[PDB]
């Protein structure tokens, strides 16, 4: 962190340079009461060469010749010397470092800031930093006055700030030839500045619900094309419903494409992590090796029940096995009318279809919206057949009818 | 509602207060004939805190700060006592209670209008609001006269709206240092303000038409593939016909990727609900179980036939059996020259390939875009391998030739 | 399309309203040498009654109550009887036929357009129209004087458009608490105006190229990721010569991926247009059925191969066979001394593959990009398993070595 | 590239028309002491139709008639003799020529810039040169005056530049009818070209970032997924830190997506070119042909493990092997108490599972993000099905145990 401040050190010394120049460049009679203040900025600005230099692309570089060109005290001189205004221009040198500064914030404060924004704000404040330079600049080409510093500064920059907003009311205006190129100039200039203002805001803007609107455009899809197949409107309320919860829970993205952008070991973590709440007590697993356990666990699919939806039917044959996440479940009788058990987060059911092809037992209807996982017979199989031992154990509890 | 109708006159004190607290600060001749309404004010903006405190994240929240900092009656003090013009402007705390309103409205009515709506709308009365604000500001401001009230309201509601739409008329404009430096801030303030709005009206216009241009462009894509690929006007007529009907009936969306965002148990209940005007009459699916119909209908794949295309040829071997869902179909001889039949939506043909690969008896042309489903006869053996009673029995309708 | 021109009269007579209502309520020196256009207007706009009635809902809809609104004479009566200016305004219900036009214009010619165009441009008429009516309101609104209608009219429409704009020269400005509050109305219409035009262009802009940035972005993305592998300049130089090839033959689209957005039956009729100078004179599959040939088709992937790539390696299995569509080849010994031939559009080698399994027995290098298509020997015996005769005639041809 | 000046001078020719012609036009003092340079440009402008007519679509074409109509001499005629100005515009047809140059640079130099930067380079030509246009216009429609031709266009460029940037002072304004429709008309200009510029610059910010805003999407998706899963900060931050190292290393870009977007053949070269430092001095395929070395090399599977992550576990069946390709491994023992070994870029194990699926005899454990390759064993079995020969050696070597 000790470059973090030194970077914040440098920003500040640049902002001075960029503050203090046209300043002085209008108005000789400072840089008497201020030297020694620049003086320190120049050797900052050049104690940053060796400070990045040794940061781990010699001297000469396309990327950083605008240091060494901000480096140099090429102030000091003209100031000093009191060079005449026509040449005295090329001290603005100093204030090539601020595109390094930028160079640097586009990078560094670039982790936790969406960059549309960072953007904007080191827009914003080139904008203000160009609009005290023009300030400036339109002050100096003035008939002299012996109107206090103040107030000339002050009417200079309400004249900017009134043109770079294309507001322009009109109360200050050119009155001579240099005074009206002048004057083009810098409405061009202003118009390039608000156009990309108003560029950047647009970006900015034109992204910041993403997951509502895809969310909301894939609803609209959905209901079109329902609409079309004429579909009845109980079920078209029961599918919006759904798209309700999906939204309200988690924010309308999809369980098998979003843990799909992970590295297999991470994803290995990931499911874990989820099913390490149901899958060490499901008894015909038990005492089965860790392998088979990781194996079983990345072929788990999820799918989501509705409230009431049937989930297994009494006399199906049926070959899944259903774990519960996050819902609940109520067992009910092939006849509909005794309820024997109700089914929670980390519990199980189905488990018998793995063994063998025996019909459903008894019907099982969603009470809430359920996010429960199942298990095929035939993934089963097929990753059973590399565990003999576990195979073997479980064709033993398969013979027991 | 009974909550959705106090939001509501939550609101209604917010804007009182916003529209009273600053024309109170410039007229003081206010406040006498007002105090009751806007002591019944506070009384309602603080019944707010218990009204969703035990909205089933205590006190001094991050989010719950700016209710208790508008909640309590900061003003009712500084009036009263008429604290002078330099500290009574903390009197405004009561505005920010639109920062919840704001949060209120947009979570409530966020349901039923697209979001980029809803933040340009409150974008809009948020720019009424403040521009009321910079009117009083601007008029207190201003040398003392004897013009009425009314008339330099006027004229100030006048000055900032011509200043924030970036107009600048020139009419009225500042004549002091202080009014210089306000008319600088709020200059670049509406600067902002209006970039804010042109920017979120490029982004609610910027996906105004979505299903259309989508469209367009993947007929686009097609057309310069087919042009490249050097193919006959005629059928790249047929194709661009065949876009129009899908545009012209579904808004071009592809049935098997729509109808693939939906979990499995409403996936299936919207194909029971599509093909449930065919699978109950089919004479070799007739006394099947209905768990083996429900295995033959989510294996059902779509397939458009525009007018007059060879659905069946007369000869060929052939395998597959269709379902017409919304066209119709002519039944021709081999020769071409008899119409055997004209089926339509509802029935089927091709049903005695499932049966046995005997070569097709009569050949099939669509009369208008069809809209058929197919099902196969790999698959149709694939999900038959799972019911060995209605294996047997299909086996004994093929052993009759 | 005796629609298709009744329908330019109506927005004929529907922009002669729009122009001569205001125009009139300002001027009553009019509508006396006018009044028989405008009657036949009124009958005119009462006949799209019936010819929209007609049209294959009812009255009193939400849809087409601005028709009927539009549509009785509310003029004729209160320019015939003089009725004060406070209540004459509703003379305006027949610029309500402007939302009909435009609906019709939204879907009718909404075909050969792009959207955003066809947005922009009622946009643009819209606001010449509305800046004719905001005219005439500011007109109406002034201080009587002698002036010439044609000269007020200038100076109103000059006004409103420098408003309009959010330029604001300021030669033209409010003088009384009326024209004042009219000036922050339209203020407020302009901004919202010329924000919308704005918003229509960025959105206009924004999508202008589309196939370019795609190709564009792919180009970047490969480029990065073999510059992170650490890729040879001389093949990172192929990859992107490759690229370059296929923006300027087909603009950069996958083969693959368009020719599956079409159904099953023009999908098919495509591929024979393609492969319909190819496959009828390979001397193995000559004298086959056409199923066997429309079965082969379907299953043949393209490939591109650049200058100088080896198509066949001699002395390797190898397995595929080959279809020259748009391209050139050369045939090669192996110690590639000696050129055997040069085989070009039209052609194939690497037939003998598909026969048997024989090593390849010369090398094949591409000449130029080629673009042919292969098929392989897996997929060649699946589908040849099912054509028993096809499948023991090349079993024969196979017996003879 | 001596087309490639002549592009240059032709422009520069039609640059020199459009800067002189107005300016002509409006002070006809000119054209006598520029005669012979003009005359050496209509020379030039004809000499363009042969060095593009022998480019290798005749004349009176849709696209070329622009050039044409530019081409004669249509000046040299109205100044030399001296038309009025109700019929000299036509003099302005040379300016077409300017659709010409502009249809040549966006297909030029459109292969190095991006499309949308082009674009509003040429906007702003366009504008600048308008506005040339503009100020000549407006100065030819001004009272006569004494005043210097230096001086009177620097007002008309003032007033042309005050009035496209929509700032609009008022310092010059209409005096007379025609010139007040004259303003009128550019003010809708001025209005339309500004809104051109603010959709330009939207469109070229609004894509400046892409790369990391999909990657930034991507982890926003995946941490509200997990999130709502209920996931431990540890992993979750394993995560992150798996995504920073993605976007550090290769911006985000996923591996298996990215080289998928090549033809087979430069698919295999840059596979060659990745596997070249690892596949050639594994000892069981020693002695294999170049065959089963391009086989197995299209068939290996990237991951990328963190730091610490259990690669292979000692005691696990297993049958993979990884290549190490841009990490580090350190191999420990059963109770990871010793390092047997630290493997690094170019290195392998899990070797001997292909051959046996012997237990695993020791552990594995990433240092760093490893980024290596994965080959199976049902892969490996699967593709060595077709070499008897290697099959046979690594059934010999299996033989030993
Ligand atoms: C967001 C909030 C932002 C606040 C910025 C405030 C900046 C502070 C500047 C000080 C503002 C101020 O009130 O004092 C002024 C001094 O300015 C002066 O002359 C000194 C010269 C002005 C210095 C530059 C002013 C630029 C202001 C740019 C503001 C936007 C920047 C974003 C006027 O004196 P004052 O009325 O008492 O005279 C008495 C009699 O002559 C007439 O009143
Ligand atoms: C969309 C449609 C919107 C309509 C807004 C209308 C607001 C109603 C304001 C009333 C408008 C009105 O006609 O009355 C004015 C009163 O304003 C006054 O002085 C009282 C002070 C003005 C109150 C604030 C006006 C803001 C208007 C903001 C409008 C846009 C807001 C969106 C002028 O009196 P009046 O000519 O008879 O004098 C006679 C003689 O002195 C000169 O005519
Ligand atoms: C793109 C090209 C567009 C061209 C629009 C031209 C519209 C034709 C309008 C006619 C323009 C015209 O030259 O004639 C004017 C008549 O306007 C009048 O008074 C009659 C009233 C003006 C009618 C409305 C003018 C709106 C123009 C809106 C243009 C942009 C619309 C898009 C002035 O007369 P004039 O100098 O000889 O007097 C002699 C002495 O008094 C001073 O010169
Ligand atoms: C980015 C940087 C761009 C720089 C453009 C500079 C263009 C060079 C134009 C020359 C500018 C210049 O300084 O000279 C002017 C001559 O203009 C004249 O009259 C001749 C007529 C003006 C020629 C057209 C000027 C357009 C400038 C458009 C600029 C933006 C374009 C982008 C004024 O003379 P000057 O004060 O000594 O008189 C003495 C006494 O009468 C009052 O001072
Ligand atoms: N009495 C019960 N209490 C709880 N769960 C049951 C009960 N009876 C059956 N089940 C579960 O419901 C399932 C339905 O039939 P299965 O054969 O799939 O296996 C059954 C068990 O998992
Ligand atoms: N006379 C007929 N009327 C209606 N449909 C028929 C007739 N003859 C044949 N078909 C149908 O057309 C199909 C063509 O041959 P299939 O063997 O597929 O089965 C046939 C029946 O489904
Ligand atoms: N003399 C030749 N002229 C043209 N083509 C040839 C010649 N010899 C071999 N080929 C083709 O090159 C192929 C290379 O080996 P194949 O066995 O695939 O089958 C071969 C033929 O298709
Ligand atoms: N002493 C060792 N030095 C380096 N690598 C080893 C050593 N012992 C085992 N390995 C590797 O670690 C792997 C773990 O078990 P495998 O059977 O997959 O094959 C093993 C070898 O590839």
């Given at each position: 962190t000790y470059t973090l401040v030194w970077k914040v050190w440098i920003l500040a010394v640049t902002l001075y340079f960029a503050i203090r120049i046209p300043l002085t460049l209008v108005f000789p009679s400072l840089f008497s009461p201020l030297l020694p203040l620049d003086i320190l900025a120049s050797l900052a600005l050049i104690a940053d060469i060796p400070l990045d230099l040794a940061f781990e692309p010699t001297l000469l570089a396309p990327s950083r010749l605008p240091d060494l060109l901000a480096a140099?005290?090429?102030?000091?001189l003209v100031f000093a010397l009191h060079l005449p205004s026509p040449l005295s221009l090329?001290?603005?040198?100093?204030?090539?470092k601020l595109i390094s500064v930028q160079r640097s914030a586009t990078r560094i404060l670039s982790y936790r800031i969406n960059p549309a924004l960072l953007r904007l704000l080191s827009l914003v404040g080139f904008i203000l930093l160009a609009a005290h330079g023009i300030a400036c600049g339109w002050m100096s080409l003035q008939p002299p006055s012996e109107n206090p510093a103040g107030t000339r500064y002050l009417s200079a920059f309400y004249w900017t700030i009134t043109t770079l907003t294309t507001?322009?009311?009109?109360?200050?205006?050119?009155?001579t030839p240099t005074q009206t190129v002048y004057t083009i100039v810098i409405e061009l200039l202003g118009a390039a500045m608000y156009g990309l203002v108003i560029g950047n805001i647009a970006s900015l803007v034109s992204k910041l619900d993403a997951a509502k609107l895809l969310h909301r455009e894939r609803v609209e899809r959905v209901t079109a094309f329902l609409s079309y197949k004429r579909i009845s409107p109980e079920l078209q309320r029961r599918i919006i419903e759904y798209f309700d919860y999906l939204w309200e829970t988690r924010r309308g993205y999809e369980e098998r494409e979003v843990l799909k952008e992970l590295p297999h070991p991470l994803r290995l973590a990931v499911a874990m992590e989820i099913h390490g709440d149901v899958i060490e007590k499901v008894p015909l697993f038990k005492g089965a090796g860790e392998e088979f356990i990781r194996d079983i666990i990345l072929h788990l699919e999820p799918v989501i029940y509705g409230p009431g939806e049937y989930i297994i039917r009494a006399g199906e044959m049926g070959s899944d096995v259903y774990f519960i996440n996050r819902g609940s479940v109520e067992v009910l009788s092939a006849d509909e009318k005794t309820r024997y058990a109700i089914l929670s987060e980390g519990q199980f059911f189905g488990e018998m279809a793995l063994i063998l092809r025996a019909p459903r037992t008894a019907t099982v209807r969603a009470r809430a919206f359920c996010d429960l996982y199942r298990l095929d017979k035939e993934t089963f199989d097929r990753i059973l057949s590399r565990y003999p031992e576990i195979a073997a154990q479980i064709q033993e509890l398969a013979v027991r009818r």
């Open positions: 140099l005290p090429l102030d000091l090329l001290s603005l040198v100093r204030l090539l507001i322009g009311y009109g109360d200050i205006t050119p009155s």
